[PDB]
Amino acid sequence: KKFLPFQQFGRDIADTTDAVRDPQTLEILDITPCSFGGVSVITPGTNTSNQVAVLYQDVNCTEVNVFQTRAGCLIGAEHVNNSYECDIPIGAGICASYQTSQSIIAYTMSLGAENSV
Amino acid sequence: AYSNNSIAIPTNFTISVTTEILPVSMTKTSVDCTMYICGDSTECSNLLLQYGSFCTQLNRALTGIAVEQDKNTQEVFAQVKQIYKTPPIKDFGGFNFSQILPDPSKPSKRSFIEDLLFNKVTKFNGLTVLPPLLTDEMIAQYTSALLAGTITSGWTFGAGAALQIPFAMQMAYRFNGIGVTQNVLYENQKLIANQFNSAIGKIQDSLSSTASALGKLQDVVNQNAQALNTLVKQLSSNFGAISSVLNDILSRLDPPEAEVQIDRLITGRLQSLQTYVTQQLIRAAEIRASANLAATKMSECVLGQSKRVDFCGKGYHLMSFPQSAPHGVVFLHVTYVPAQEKNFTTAPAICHDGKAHFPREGVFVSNGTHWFVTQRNFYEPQIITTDNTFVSGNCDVVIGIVNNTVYDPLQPELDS
Amino acid sequence: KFNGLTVLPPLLTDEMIAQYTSALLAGTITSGWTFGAGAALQIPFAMQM
Amino acid sequence: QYGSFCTQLNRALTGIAVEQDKNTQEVFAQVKQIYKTPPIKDFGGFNFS
Amino acid sequence: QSLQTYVTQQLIRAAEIRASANLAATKMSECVLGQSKRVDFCGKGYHLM
Amino acid sequence: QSLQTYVTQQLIRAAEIRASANLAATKMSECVLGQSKRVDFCGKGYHLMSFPQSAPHGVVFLHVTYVPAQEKNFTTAPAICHDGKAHFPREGVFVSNGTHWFVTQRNFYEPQIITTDNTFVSGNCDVVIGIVNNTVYDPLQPELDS
Numbered sequence A: 001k002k003f004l005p006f007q008q009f010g011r012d013i014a015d016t017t018d019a020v021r022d023p024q025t026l027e028i029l030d031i032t033p034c035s036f037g038g039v040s041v042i043t044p045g046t047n048t049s050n051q052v053a054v055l056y057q058d059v060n061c062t063e064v065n066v067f068q069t070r071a072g073c074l075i076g077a078e079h080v081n082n083s084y085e086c087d088i089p090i091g092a093g094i095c096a097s098y099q100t101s102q103s104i105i106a107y108t109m110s111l112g113a114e115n116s117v
Numbered sequence B: 001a002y003s004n005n006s007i008a009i010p011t012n013f014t015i016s017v018t019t020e021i022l023p024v025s026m027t028k029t030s031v032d033c034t035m036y037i038c039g040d041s042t043e044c045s046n047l048l049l050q051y052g053s054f055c056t057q058l059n060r061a062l063t064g065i066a067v068e069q070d071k072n073t074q075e076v077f078a079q080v081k082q083i084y085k086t087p088p089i090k091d092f093g094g095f096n097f098s099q100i101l102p103d104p105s106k107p108s109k110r111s112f113i114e115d116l117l118f119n120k121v122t123k124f125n126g127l128t129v130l131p132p133l134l135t136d137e138m139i140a141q142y143t144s145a146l147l148a149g150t151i152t153s154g155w156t157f158g159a160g161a162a163l164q165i166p167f168a169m170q171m172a173y174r175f176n177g178i179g180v181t182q183n184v185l186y187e188n189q190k191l192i193a194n195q196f197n198s199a200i201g202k203i204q205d206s207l208s209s210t211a212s213a214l215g216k217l218q219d220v221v222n223q224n225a226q227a228l229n230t231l232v233k234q235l236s237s238n239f240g241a242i243s244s245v246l247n248d249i250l251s252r253l254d255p256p257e258a259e260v261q262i263d264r265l266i267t268g269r270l271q272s273l274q275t276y277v278t279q280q281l282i283r284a285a286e287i288r289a290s291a292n293l294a295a296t297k298m299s300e301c302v303l304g305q306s307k308r309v310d311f312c313g314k315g316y317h318l319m320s321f322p323q324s325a326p327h328g329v330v331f332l333h334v335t336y337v338p339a340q341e342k343n344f345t346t347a348p349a350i351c352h353d354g355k356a357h358f359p360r361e362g363v364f365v366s367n368g369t370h371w372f373v374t375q376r377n378f379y380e381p382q383i384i385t386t387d388n389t390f391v392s393g394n395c396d397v398v399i400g401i402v403n404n405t406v407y408d409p410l411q412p413e414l415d416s
Numbered sequence C: 001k002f003n004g005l006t007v008l009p010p011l012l013t014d015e016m017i018a019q020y021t022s023a024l025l026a027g028t029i030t031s032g033w034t035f036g037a038g039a040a041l042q043i044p045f046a047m048q049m
Numbered sequence D: 001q002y003g004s005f006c007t008q009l010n011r012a013l014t015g016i017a018v019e020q021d022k023n024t025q026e027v028f029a030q031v032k033q034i035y036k037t038p039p040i041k042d043f044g045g046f047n048f049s
Numbered sequence E: 001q002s003l004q005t006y007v008t009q010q011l012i013r014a015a016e017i018r019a020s021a022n023l024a025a026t027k028m029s030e031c032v033l034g035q036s037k038r039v040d041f042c043g044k045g046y047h048l049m
Numbered sequence F: 001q002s003l004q005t006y007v008t009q010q011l012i013r014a015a016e017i018r019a020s021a022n023l024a025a026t027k028m029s030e031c032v033l034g035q036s037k038r039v040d041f042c043g044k045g046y047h048l049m050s051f052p053q054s055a056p057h058g059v060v061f062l063h064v065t066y067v068p069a070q071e072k073n074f075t076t077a078p079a080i081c082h083d084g085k086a087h088f089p090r091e092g093v094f095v096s097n098g099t100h101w102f103v104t105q106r107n108f109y110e111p112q113i114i115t116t117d118n119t120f121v122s123g124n125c126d127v128v129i130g131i132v133n134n135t136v137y138d139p140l141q142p143e144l145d146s
């Protein structure tokens, strides 16, 4: 960012300060707020397993068998190839299920068995 | 130009492609109530618990809207069990779907018209947008399957397993569905394809010219922005406290008076979230009621030929093609419109033997000198025969009957 | 009646509502369904029935 | 000191007040041309007067 | 709080009127501009017009 | 404030249930009391009939549908030539098993012989794309000559 020589702070459209000029070094730092989000718990029924996978919504996994996804950071579930139907929804095309020696898996879901007519 | 004996019949038609746009989901959202009201303050959280369940009663509600927006998008688009595909060959009788079928070269496989639609439509205070369960890539794969099923197999993929048909015969069943005889297509097939392909052209230029056409979709995005911008600006309001800034009440006063200055800010920021959640719950119901209509048009319009007047565009409905948009769907309804009418004299019935004759499928007309029977929605005059007419009664019982020769095709054939 | 309260008028006043119902009714009687689909096509009312 | 609530309440009631003219327009204005009946009421015996 | 009550009531009411104007616009499209094969939609009986 | 909240949640809920009771009334009027041509409105398939059953605070429709369940590939043509004039199927489509031509109803394979009673005519074969050549049997020809 290039502030004018007398501007000391920089503001987002929401009137929230998003940059500042270091008063001992006339150059501008971005402020990015400290990372937060929902902690979501993914489970098959307790009539099936007491395994849980945890999704930390909209974090890079750095701030927390660990997967970066467009929904957030998914932990305790293993990424896989085979595209299944959705079982538990997760976001951004990802779903999770409990599958075979059985663990929670995470995958981009299949829409349906393809058919050139 | 009404009279007791005049009818106008169309001598030509125009295949027209109309655009109809519906919103289908909101921006999903969860707000952490406690962080919105009392962000980075345990001293404020200690007071927020005096109000009990309101904090969760609001999170549950916003969860209800967010979980529903993926039901709305599933109901509209996931109306198919199989990802139907077209062949690499494009022998659709002359019908040029290239502008609405996928472009495989782009990293999301949307159509050309879907890129026009995506181009025309556009914080850390507990506020968090959640991604949709279906990415615009998977929404675009469902609309491609619905469209490749429609083109290769007519309505049949909605009823059961897809049963292929030639597209020039599918359009003959369509034409038959609007009460127009199958030969009106096969004799005009290269005209009807050029009318159709011209109409698909006009739609691109209409979409390219302005953003106002997607106004329904843009308004849904605009209202979620206005209600988040308003929810955020209400953090800065005093509500009758000495300040809005929570750390400044937690330093310019001691606890016994800070508790009342904070209850001012909690009572205002809680009235601010109860207002936002109420506005959103009503708004979300306005979009559920639109997603249920888009689902209904996708079933009755795309997956079939609707007979419901003006439900599937102006004119007699032939077929329609679903295209995605950000938070919405677009239907391209193809409709037959009767274009160029001529007046004829007409009569309800005719006399040939004192018994009265009536048209099986159509109406009696005369050019002035000769009487004919023609299909009701297109001028194509048959000479009047015992093959084209049925009988009842006698010529005294009907008001407005006229006399004319009926050809019996069996007479020459018996004499020969 | 003065505490900010106002009733804005409708955009279509009831004469203009009644011209549309006249047009819809006159179209229905003199041309069957054909005025809904395209340019209207006259038919004798007993043939429409 | 209550901030936006006033502006928001005026907007919400404006949003309703505009919508009442969308409703009336979409019900009645389903017709491009104002069709009219002839003076000769020969409707096959049906009396729409 | 007495305006946030009234505007909540009016937003909930206006969506119920919206839902009825959408029915009335659909009846005018399918029932008046056409003939409805949908049973009991356009009054009990076989619908003519 | 806890009542005005509950009563607001309830007024929005009752609007969500009113919108469903108006769908249930429509499904009962249109496809219990009738047969519905609307696609997927009353079950997947082509609609035959439905049977209303009650449930606590609701209704359950048992929609009975015709699902086409086996199929065969045929060759087909939009029309056929015979006397140079072009013949089209009255109800149905033309099909061939690979050696003979038939006319059959579109939604179920039951073939008929091609006849001047199962077809109608317009124009000539120079106007129509994809037309084929086959006999059309006129049931009058034997009935005159015998």
Ligand SMILES: *[C@@H]1O[C@H](CO)[C@@H](O[C@@H]2O[C@H](CO)[C@@H](O)[C@H](O)[C@H]2NC(C)=O)[C@H](O)[C@H]1NC(C)=O
Pocket: B090, B096, B098, B099
């Ligand atoms: C379908 O329409 C597209 C254009 O909308 C055709 O593709 C164009 O073909 C012309 C030659 O006629 C080329 O000059 C253009 O560069 C092509 N444009 C694009 C974007 O491909 C296509 O050939 C048409 N197909 C049929 C069967 O008519």
Ligand SMILES: *[C@@H]1O[C@H](CO)[C@@H](O[C@@H]2O[C@H](CO)[C@@H](O)[C@H](O)[C@H]2NC(C)=O)[C@H](O)[C@H]1NC(C)=O
Pocket: B367, B368, B369, B370
């Ligand atoms: C009304 O229709 C008849 C039948 O088409 C017209 O008479 C035919 O006219 C053509 C030329 O267009 C001649 O080749 C035929 O020999 C005529 N056939 C018969 C059986 O007369 C007639 O001219 C038309 N009348 C009007 C008022 O246009």
Ligand SMILES: *[C@@H]1O[C@H](CO)[C@@H](O[C@@H]2O[C@H](CO)[C@@H](O)[C@H](O)[C@H]2NC(C)=O)[C@H](O)[C@H]1NC(C)=O
Pocket: B351, B401, B402, B403
């Ligand atoms: C249609 O033509 C027939 C003739 O084929 C008319 O019948 C005649 O009517 C007159 C009285 O108007 C009698 O004098 C004749 O004896 C009748 N002849 C026959 C064969 O019936 C009939 O009236 C005409 N109808 C119309 C509506 O013009």
Ligand SMILES: *[C@@H]1O[C@H](CO)[C@@H](O[C@@H]2O[C@H](CO)[C@@H](O)[C@H](O)[C@H]2NC(C)=O)[C@H](O)[C@H]1NC(C)=O
Pocket: D041, D047, D049
């Ligand atoms: C249509 O029917 C109405 C009756 O419902 C007719 O009105 C009557 O008209 C006669 C004269 O024709 C008067 O004697 C009566 O006093 C009228 N009654 C009423 C209630 O107005 C009307 O005139 C008929 N119109 C046509 C064109 O036949």
Ligand SMILES: *[C@@H]1O[C@H](CO)[C@@H](O[C@@H]2O[C@H](CO)[C@@H](O)[C@H](O)[C@H]2NC(C)=O)[C@H](O)[C@H]1NC(C)=O
Pocket: F097, F098, F099, F100
């Ligand atoms: C196509 O269908 C026709 C009619 O069913 C078949 O021809 C008949 O075959 C039987 C022997 O299996 C003969 O007895 C009949 O006389 C035939 N009828 C005619 C009109 O020729 C024909 O064999 C079928 N083709 C195939 C490829 O199975």
Ligand SMILES: *[C@@H]1O[C@H](CO)[C@@H](O)[C@H](O)[C@H]1NC(C)=O
Pocket: A024, A025, A026
């Ligand atoms: C601020 O002080 C540093 C020394 O610590 C000096 O190098 C720098 O040039 C000074 N900047 C200004 C704007 O006076």
Ligand SMILES: *[C@@H]1O[C@H](CO)[C@@H](O)[C@H](O)[C@H]1NC(C)=O
Pocket: A060, A061, A062
């Ligand atoms: C943050 O996320 C990006 C992917 O968008 C990734 O490249 C990067 O390595 C992540 N940061 C860390 C420190 O892991």
Ligand SMILES: *[C@@H]1O[C@H](CO)[C@@H](O)[C@H](O)[C@H]1NC(C)=O
Pocket: B011, B012, B013, B014, B195, B340
């Ligand atoms: C019908 O309209 C087309 C243009 O869409 C025109 O080329 C054609 O000549 C017209 N045909 C008749 C029979 O008027």
Ligand SMILES: *[C@@H]1O[C@H](CO)[C@@H](O)[C@H](O)[C@H]1NC(C)=O
Pocket: B003, B004, B005, B399, B400, D042
């Ligand atoms: C039809 O209208 C004309 C006047 O245009 C009239 O002379 C004739 O008697 C009427 N016929 C019938 C059966 O209504």
Ligand SMILES: *[C@@H]1O[C@H](CO)[C@@H](O)[C@H](O)[C@H]1NC(C)=O
Pocket: B089, B091, F129, F130, F131
């Ligand atoms: C149908 O398409 C094929 C190409 O797959 C072509 O060879 C054939 O001549 C076409 N026939 C007609 C009637 O268009």
